[PDB]
Structure formats: C-alpha cells, structure tokens
RNA sequence: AGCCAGGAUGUUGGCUUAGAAGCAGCCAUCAUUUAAAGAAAGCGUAAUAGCUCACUGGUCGAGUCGGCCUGCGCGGAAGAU
C-alpha cells in the first residue's frame, strides 16, 4: 500500500533531510508514479495522479529533489 | 504544595479555585502542580 | 462608508477640551477650501472604533452636523500619550 | 440547567411535608429532614416540586440550584437509597462486620474498630471487599471517608483502603 | 459547520433527490478510515467516480432538507442515523452495495435503509440488480 | 554595554522628569514596548531586557532600541561623610516619560512579539504595555 | 457545557546515538486519504507502545464566547512590655 511500497523510493526506505541535508535518495519522473498508478488496491478513489503528484512533490521536501 | 505570591496554570488540566481566604490551584493528575497563593 | 455625527463647540479652550474629554467626547477642527474653520466635537468611542480600519485614513469619510453632510478626509490624528485614546482628530475639507 | 431551571420529579410513595423553610421526606428507605436557607420558597402544588428563591437578595439563584440538587439527591436516596464500596488491596488487611461496628486489622499492632450511623448498613463477603448502603449520600460519603482515612493508597506499592472507582498510580520509587 | 456551508448542505439536499438520492446508513465504527476505505472503494466503483457517505444528521433537515420525495424521508433524522447519499439513479445497485457490506461486520442501526424509493422493506426486493 | 564613547561633561545635575515623551509612535518596526509609567531606566536594565527578548525570539526578526541612557548617575562610597565634593560616576540611566517607546520589533509573529515584550517587561522596573504599528 | 465515537501511512525515516523511534537532546515537521492525524502537546515508556488533547461528528435545548476602558475589593503584609 503506502508503507512497504513507499519505502521503495530510490533504493533505501528514507535517508534524506528536507532543505539541504544528508540525502541519499533521488527521484525520476515515474519511479514513484508507478507505485501509485499500477496499484488499484490502495486507491481511495480513481484519480491516481492526484496522489502521484503529492508524492512527486514531497520527494523534494523530503530530500529527493527532482 | 507550592505556596507563592503569583500563581498560574502549569498545564491546562490545573483548575484554580478561591477558598475561605486564599486562592488554590489543583491538578487532578499531578500532585506537584498543587499551588497556593500565600 | 464612514459616516460620523458631530456637534458645534459652544466653548473652546483647554478647560473646555478637558471637560469634554472627561465627558467622553473629544473636539476636532475642520478647515480647508475657502471657508472659515469650524470647531466640532465627536463621540470618542465611535471614532476610536472607526479609526481601526486603514480605510478610515485612506478613504473619504462624511461628517454630519445640523443636517449638513459634508465629506472630508483625515490627515492628522493626535493619540493619547499612554492610553488607547485619540484626541482632536483633524479633518480636511474636499 | 442555568439556575435550578430543570425541575425535579417526585415519584409516588414519597410523602413530603413542606413547612416554610423546613422540609421532611418519608419513604420506604428511611426518613430525612432539611431546614433551608433564606434564598428558598420551593413550591409543591403538583405531582412534583420546582424550586424558587425568596425575593430581595443579591444571591439566591445559586442557592436555589444547590437546594434543588440536594433535594433531588435526597429524594433518590429515600426512594431507592445509595450504595458504595471499598476494596482493601494488600495482604493482612482484614475487614470484619460485627453488626454496627467494623473491625479493620490493617498491619496495626492495635486493631481499630469504627462505629456506624444508625442509617447505614454494611456487609463484607470477604475480609477485603466491604459494601455499604444508606439513605443520605452526604452521610454515606462521610462514613466512607472515615473508613478510608485509616490508610491511604501509597503510590510506591499500592496498599491501603480505597474506593472501587479510585485509580491509584505507581510511577517509580528507585527502580529497586 | 459554518452557515456558508450549511446553505450548501441544504442546496445539495434539495438537489440530490431531484436526480435520485439512493441513501443508506453507515456505522460510526465502519466509518473509521482503517475500515471505511473498503466501503468507499466499493460504492465508488459500483456507482461512478464520486461518492458521498458523509453524514449530515439534522432534525430540521428532515422537515425542510432531505424530504423532497413522495411522503417518507423524516425517519433517518434523529437518534444517530448516518447519511450516505448517492447521485446516480433512484434504483441502482447502491442499496445492494450496503446490503453486501452488511454481511461483512455491519449491523449498526437501521438495516441500511433510506428514502424508501422502491417500497423497500427490511428484505430487499428483486428490483435491485442481481 | 550602552554608554557614550565621550561626553562634553562627565557630571550632570539630578534634574526632574516632568513632561510627556516625544517618541510615542512606532516607526522602526511593527510592534513596540511602550512605557506607561514614569521613572528611570539604567543601561544595565536595558541590557537585561535586551537579553531577555533575544532569548525569547531567535535570529527570527529585527529589533531596535529607541532609548539610550545618556545620563551619568553617580554615588558616594561607604563610610564617608557629606560634602567635600561630588562622588564619582557610577552608571548611566535615562529619563523615561509616560508613552515612551523602548523596544521595537519587526518580522516576528504577533503572539511571539507579545510573549517577548511580556518577558522584557518582567525584567524592566517601569510598567510597560504592548503597542502595534500605527496605521497613520 | 457534559457524554459517546473517530483521530492512518511512509515513520521504529536518516547524523551522534547496546538505544532516538512523537518527547537526555535534538539536526529535520514533509506529503495522499477522509469530517478529522500536529515526525504528535502531555505523562511516562532505556526507548516502542497506550490514551486523551489539536481537530471532527452525534445526543442534550437559549445563552455563551475572549479583547478594551475603568470603580470598589483579594494575597503578597513577619518583631520583639
Ligand atoms: Mg487650568
Ligand atoms: Zn497540572
């Protein structure tokens, strides 16, 4: 769902700081898009992109800048 | 109980009452917060 | 939007102004244009409530005295030295 | 409510004699009497009573509320009575019901016997769980406090007389 | 909520029934997010892409709000009766969705009934898609 | 600490503290701690209040001090008689009139400024109050 | 106002840290879901946890809410024939 498949961001669960800190993870254009698009089990609704954009934008705020 | 001049609320759970000639602060959970206006 | 009522000052001076302030109404002067200045007096609390908005100073207001509703501005305000009060608001015509 | 605005309803079988500021209630569960303050005028002209204070006082609404609450509690305790209970958490804490006298041997070299009011009954199925019943919840609470005053629940171990709904705490003494 | 949203609540209550408000009741325990997502998913996939299981319990909404159908809509107003309203149709499978959800640990208040559109008794009729 | 680098004269008369204050308007910031009473503020008290408000609010915001002692207050040592001259200068204080604005602050939340100025008042001897920016 | 119920996930995230996890202490408080989640306010847990609180809804039936101007009072207020 959003835990065991969200720990798969760049190779590690999460190892980055928000503004500019000890970051170990990055993000591509579809790496975290697929983990929310390919899954029709955890979706509250049908808008997959609605929760995909949130993860893509919070990758930067966690340390996985685009 | 802590007796002092100026009394207040340490945590929100503390209630202030006014008895015969004094003002007291009583906390239901933590006895340490018990205070009096001496 | 701002509409205030006024009265004409029967007596003017330090003693009259301080008596008015004790009576909870403060004086004011209206001048400008080519007409003689007029000494009015206003309720203090109404003006204090109205002056809170920035629009009171940045927009035209109207003052009504003896049935005449004249539109004026607010250029200078003298605040109380150490209290949330204003004394002798200044109104400029036109 | 705001001030004794919510009326009390008195069930049938509870005889009430109201005389000015003095009221008497007689039911199956004992008899009670109360003479009130000067902020009263409660009236009884229907199936129940609804309170009122006397005119000409800066106070009076709060007193009417207090009188209404007290009379409601007394009506409830005279029509059905109230009951409380105490639990003795600890080895050697023996409680015995000798009729109208309780015996409380709680780690004392000198055993202590306590008297009871004439309107209070008590019974203990064991030596640690005591249950008492009465008509007046004020007297019930007073006697319960008298019983519990012999020993308080110590936070460091958790022994001593306490109410059934009392919540004791055990934070830490020294880790040993 | 605020009066500006209370206005919209009544506007929706008197626009919901016009296009068909198939309604039901959801438990407070079944409305928990840990176990509400299943019902949300089921109802949404069955009906459309939008869902509304939000409860809007009111007494005056049973005299001037929800009731716009034939005669009976004021029996789901008081006594903790949750509101679950669905737009698409007055005879769709939304009743059957809650009937199925009943079998999976849902026995809360009123046997998932509301708006009495197809003269629905405690037992569902054959009108619903099977 | 706050003290003039040099002065024309080192000893000044006691003087008085009659009259109101000129700096009664908030100009260098958005919030101000305005003294509502009367008395004198020492450079030591000003430093204490500045440290208190610095602890209260972090690099988060700019703070201006609208006052400066400029008044040398002297005292005589212990076990000495009267006359024979004037004592050596001991410290520096200012004369504070009602309505005087002491500390101004900008770039901070309103509640944080309120708390910081309350803490500063707790250190200051003279009764003070909180004044917001004037629309005028 | 009481009462009832709800109040997830990455996340026990990554530096120091047998340990740091929402609480020696913190560097960092980000995001979707819903009416509701704040790297979580509290206690304490070595530390997790746990509940309430922030917030939301429902039962109960007309006053309540937190800011200013002030008046009179309250405690600070303990000495020796
Ligand atoms: Mg004079
Ligand atoms: Zn407390």
Swiss-Prot record, chain A:
Assembly description: Part of the ribosomal stalk of the 50S ribosomal subunit. Interacts with L10 and the large rRNA to form the base of the stalk. L10 forms an elongated spine to which 2 L12 dimers bind in a sequential fashion forming a pentameric L10(L12)2(L12)2 complex.
Name of the protein this chain belongs to: Large ribosomal subunit protein uL11
Positions in coiled-coil regions: none
Function recorded in the entry: Forms part of the ribosomal stalk which helps the ribosome interact with GTP-bound translation factors.
Molecular function GO terms recorded: large ribosomal subunit rRNA binding; rRNA binding; structural constituent of ribosome
In-chain residues carrying the UniProt-annotated modification N6-succinyllysine: 7
Family of this protein: Belongs to the universal ribosomal protein uL11 family.
Entry's Gene Ontology BP terms: cytoplasmic translation; ribosomal large subunit assembly; stringent response; translation; translational termination
Alphabetical keyword list: Methylation, Ribonucleoprotein, Ribosomal protein, RNA-binding, rRNA-binding
Cellular component, GO, one term: cytoplasm
Source species: Escherichia coli (strain K12)
UniProtKB/Swiss-Prot annotation, chain B:
Bilayer-spanning residue ranges: none
Keyword Ribonucleoprotein tagged: yes
GO MF, one annotated term: structural constituent of ribosome
Tree of life domain: Bacteria
Gene Ontology CC terms: cytoplasm; cytosolic large ribosomal subunit
One protein family per Pfam: Ribosomal_L36
Record-linked InterPro entries: Ribosomal_bL36 (IPR000473), Ribosomal_bL36_sp (IPR035977)
Assembly and interaction partners: Part of the 50S ribosomal subunit.
Protein family: Belongs to the bacterial ribosomal protein bL36 family.
Protein's recorded name: Large ribosomal subunit protein bL36A
Phylogenetic classification of the source organism: Bacteria, Pseudomonadati, Pseudomonadota, Gammaproteobacteria, Enterobacterales
Gene label: rpmJ
Swiss-Prot record, chain E:
Keyword 4Fe-4S included in the entry's annotation: no
Gene Ontology molecular-function annotations: large ribosomal subunit rRNA binding; ribosome binding; structural constituent of ribosome
GO biological process, one term: translation
Modified residues (N6-acetyllysine): 36, 104
Domain of life of the native organism: Bacteria
Any further remark recorded for this protein: Ribosomal protein L8 appears to be an aggregate of ribosomal proteins L7/L12 and L10.
UniProt subunit comment: Part of the ribosomal stalk of the 50S ribosomal subunit. The N-terminus interacts with L11 and the large rRNA to form the base of the stalk. The C-terminus forms an elongated spine to which 2 L12 dimers bind in a sequential fashion forming a pentameric L10(L12)(L12)2 complex. Two L12 dimers associate with a copy of L10 to form a very strong complex (called L8).
Function: Forms part of the ribosomal stalk, playing a central role in the interaction of the ribosome with GTP-bound translation factors. Protein L10 is also a translational repressor protein. It controls the translation of the rplJL-rpoBC operon by binding to its mRNA.
Family indicated by similarity: Belongs to the universal ribosomal protein uL10 family.
Protein known as: Large ribosomal subunit protein uL10
Protein species of origin: Escherichia coli (strain K12)
Residues of the full protein shown: 2 to 131 of 165
UniProtKB/Swiss-Prot annotation, chain F:
Tagged with keyword Thylakoid: no
Keywords: Hydroxylation, Methylation, Ribonucleoprotein, Ribosomal protein, RNA-binding, rRNA-binding, tRNA-binding
Gene Ontology BP annotations: cytoplasmic translation; ribosomal large subunit assembly
GO molecular function terms noted in the UniProt entry: rRNA binding; structural constituent of ribosome; tRNA binding
Alphabetized InterPro entries for the sequence: Ribosomal_uL16, Ribosomal_uL16_bact-type, Ribosomal_uL16_CS, Ribosomal_uL16_dom, Ribosomal_uL16_sf
GO cellular component, one term: cytosolic large ribosomal subunit
Pfam families tied to this protein: Ribosomal_L16
Source superkingdom: Bacteria
PANTHER family: 50S/60S RIBOSOMAL PROTEIN L16 (PTHR12220), LARGE RIBOSOMAL SUBUNIT PROTEIN UL16M (PTHR12220:SF13)
Family affiliation: Belongs to the universal ribosomal protein uL16 family.
The protein's name: Large ribosomal subunit protein uL16
Species classification: Bacteria, Pseudomonadati, Pseudomonadota, Gammaproteobacteria, Enterobacterales
């Amino acid at each position: 769902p959003a835990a065991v498949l969200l720990k798969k961001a760049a190779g590690i669960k999460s190892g980055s700081g928000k503004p500019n800190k000890d970051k170990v993870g990055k993000i591509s254009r579809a790496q975290l898009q697929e983990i929310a698009q390919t899954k029709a089990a955890d979706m509250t609704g049908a808008d997959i992109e609605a929760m995909t954009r949130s993860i893509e934008g919070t990758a930067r705020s966690m340390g996985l800048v685009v | 109980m802590k007796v002092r001049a100026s009394v207040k609320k340490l945590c929100r759970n503390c209630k202030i009452v006014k008895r015969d000639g004094v003002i007291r602060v009583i906390c239901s959970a933590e006895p340490k917060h018990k205070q009096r206006q001496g | 939007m701002f509409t205030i009522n006024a009265e004409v000052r029967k007596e003017q001076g330090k003693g009259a102004s301080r008596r008015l302030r004790a009576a909870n109404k403060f004086p004011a002067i209206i001048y400008g244009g080519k007409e003689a200045p007029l000494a009015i007096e206003l309720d203090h609390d109404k003006v204090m409530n109205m002056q809170a908005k920035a629009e009171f100073y940045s927009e035209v207001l109207t003052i009504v005295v003896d049935g005449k509703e004249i539109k004026v501005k607010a250029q200078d305000v003298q605040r109380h030295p150490y209290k949330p009060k204003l004394q002798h608001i200044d109104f400029v015509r036109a | 409510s705001r001030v004794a605005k919510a009326p009390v309803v008195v069930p049938a079988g509870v005889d009430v004699k109201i005389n000015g500021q003095v009221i008497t209630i007689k039911g199956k569960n004992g008899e009670l009497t109360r003479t009130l303050n000067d902020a009263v005028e409660v009236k009884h002209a229907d199936n129940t009573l609804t309170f009122g204070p006397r005119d000409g006082y800066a106070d009076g609404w709060a007193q009417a509320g207090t009188a209404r609450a007290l009379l409601n509690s007394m009506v409830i305790g005279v029509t059905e009575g109230f009951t409380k209970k105490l639990q003795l958490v600890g080895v050697g804490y023996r409680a015995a019901v000798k009729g109208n006298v309780i015996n409380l041997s709680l780690g004392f070299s000198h055993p202590v016997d306590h008297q009871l009011p004439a309107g209070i009954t008590a019974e203990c199925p064991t030596q640690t769980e005591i249950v008492l019943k009465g008509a007046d919840k004020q007297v019930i609470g007073q006697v319960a406090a008298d019983l519990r005053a012999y020993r308080r629940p110590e936070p460091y171990k958790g022994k001593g007389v306490r109410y059934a709904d009392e919540v004791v705490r055990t934070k830490e003494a020294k880790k040993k | 909520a605020l009066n500006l949203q209370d206005k919209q609540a009544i506007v929706a209550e008197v626009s919901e029934v016009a296009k068909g408000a198939l309604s039901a009741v959801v438990a407070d325990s079944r409305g928990v997010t840990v176990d509400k997502m299943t019902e949300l998913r089921k109802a949404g996939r069955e009906a459309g892409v939008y869902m509304r299981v939000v409860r809007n319990t009111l007494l005056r909404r049973a005299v001037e709000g929800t009731p716009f159908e034939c005669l009976k809509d004021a029996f789901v107003g008081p006594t903790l009766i949750a509101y679950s309203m669905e737009h698409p149709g007055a005879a769709a499978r939304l009743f059957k969705e809650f009937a199925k959800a009943n079998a999976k640990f849902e026995v809360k208040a009123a046997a998932f009934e509301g708006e009495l559109i197809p003269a629905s008794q405690i037992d569902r009729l054959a009108t619903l898609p099977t | 600490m706050l003290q003039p680098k040099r002065t024309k004269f080192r000893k000044m008369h006691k003087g008085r503290n009659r009259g109101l204050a000129q700096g009664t308007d908030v100009s260098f910031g958005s919030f101000g701690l305005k003294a509502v009473g009367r008395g004198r503020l020492t450079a030591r008290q000003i430093e204490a209040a500045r440290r208190a408000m610095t602890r209260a609010v972090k690099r988060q915001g700019k703070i201006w001090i609208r006052v400066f002692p400029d008044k040398p207050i002297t005292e005589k040592p212990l076990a000495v008689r009267m006359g024979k001259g004037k004592g050596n200068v001991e410290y520096w204080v200012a004369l504070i009139q009602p309505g005087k604005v002491l500390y101004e602050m900008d770039g901070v939340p309103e509640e944080l400024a309120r708390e910081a100025f309350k803490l500063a008042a707790a250190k200051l001897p003279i009764k003070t109050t909180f004044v917001t920016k004037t629309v005028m």
